[PDB]
Design a protein around this ligand. Structure first.
Ligand SMILES: Cc1cc2nc3c(=O)[nH]c(=O)nc-3n(C[C@H](O)[C@H](O)[C@H](O)COP(=O)(O)OP(=O)(O)OC[C@H]3O[C@@H](n4cnc5c(N)ncnc54)[C@H](O)[C@@H]3O)c2cc1C
Length: 271
């Protein structure tokens, strides 16, 4: 009988930072305390939360999908990539929210709001997808799910992958195509490969890198038509195709190539 954190979609909940673990040069795991050790977040699979803060005199809000689930009591874990200032020539200021998180000290609060998102996984292949906030969800059961992720776009995918895999009577097959800049930028790799080794019948996994290392058994370059053809389920299976990554990745690498392969837009969803 766990108390729920996100009781109302219109309340901001200030949660305290209680751990900070360095994952890579620019990525971290941040753990926040829920209101009590017995609370759960209350975040339906397929949905995300928003973080909000006053940054440079304006309210800034950004979506994040936790790596924790409603099974976890008393905490929420976020994996965050920091866009550092004075690093990119065309973006000297860096990223607003990610750097706010980066500067947070133990005990500092940040406000959570949700749940949010047009898609909810209802289990055993069933997805409930609203065309917009104001409309009812369309219910469609699928045998397989294609997933294309770039960078932190992995988190909405992992959330769904984990939900499917932990249900032994969920026979949905997930095919993930995961793109990153360099090998060191592949987030949650041990977790993904642990799941693939355990659930290989239901989980297919493929990587591509903008720049690959000398020893590399996967893809290199940008996501393209052949990669989607070979590493996502065929259009005949009528899969749902999920996408999360930088908007230009969706626009140039994903949409046109899904069109080539023959996945119709009505069976595609961008987180
Ligand atoms: C459903 C969903 C789930 C998400 N889950 C996560 C998650 O789990 N973890 C996570 O970290 N993010 C996640 N994101 C992305 C997140 O919402 C933000 O887009 C991200 O944190 C960057 O926001 P920001 O305010 O820090 O940067 P912004 O202020 O929005 O600016 C960052 C943008 O400016 C440019 N830029 C600025 N600085 C740099 C730099 N140093 N190097 C290169 N480019 C730069 C880039 O184009 C970048 O896209 C998710 C997004 C969605 C839609």
């Amino acid at each position: 009988t766990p108390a729920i954190t996100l009781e109302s979609p219109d309340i901001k909940y200030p949660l305290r930072l209680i751990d900070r673990e360095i994952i890579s040069h620019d990525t971290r795991r941040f753990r926040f305390a829920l209101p009590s050790p017995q609370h759960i977040l209350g975040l339906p699979v397929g949905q995300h939360i928003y973080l909000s803060a006053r940054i440079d005199g304006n309210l800034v809000v950004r979506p994040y999908t936790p790596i924790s689930s409603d099974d976890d009591k008393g905490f929420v874990d976020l994996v965050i990539k920091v866009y550092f200032k004075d690093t990119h020539p065309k973006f000297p200021a860096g990223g607003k929210m990610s750097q706010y998180l980066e500067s947070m000290q133990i005990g500092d609060t940040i406000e959570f709001r949700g749940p949010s998102g047009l898609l909810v996984y209802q289990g055993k292949g069933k997805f409930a997808i609203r065309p917009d906030k104001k409309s009812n969800p369309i219910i469609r059961t699928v045998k397989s799910v294609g997933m294309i992720a770039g960078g932190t776009g992995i988190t909405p995918m992992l959330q769904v992958i984990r939900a499917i895999m932990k249900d032994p009577d969920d026979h949905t097959v997930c095919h993930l195509l995961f793109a990153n800049q360099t090998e060191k930028d592949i987030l949650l790799r041990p977790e993904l490969e642990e799941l693939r080794n355990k659930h290989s019948a239901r989980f297919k996994l493929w990587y591509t890198l903008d720049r690959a290392p000398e020893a590399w058994d996967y893809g290199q370059g940008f996501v393209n038509e052949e990669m989607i053809r070979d590493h996502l389920p065929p259009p005949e299976e009528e899969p749902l195709v999920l996408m999360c990554g930088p908007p230009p990745m969706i626009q140039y690498a994903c949409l046109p190539n899904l069109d080539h392969v023959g996945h119709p837009t009505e069976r595609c969803f961008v987180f």
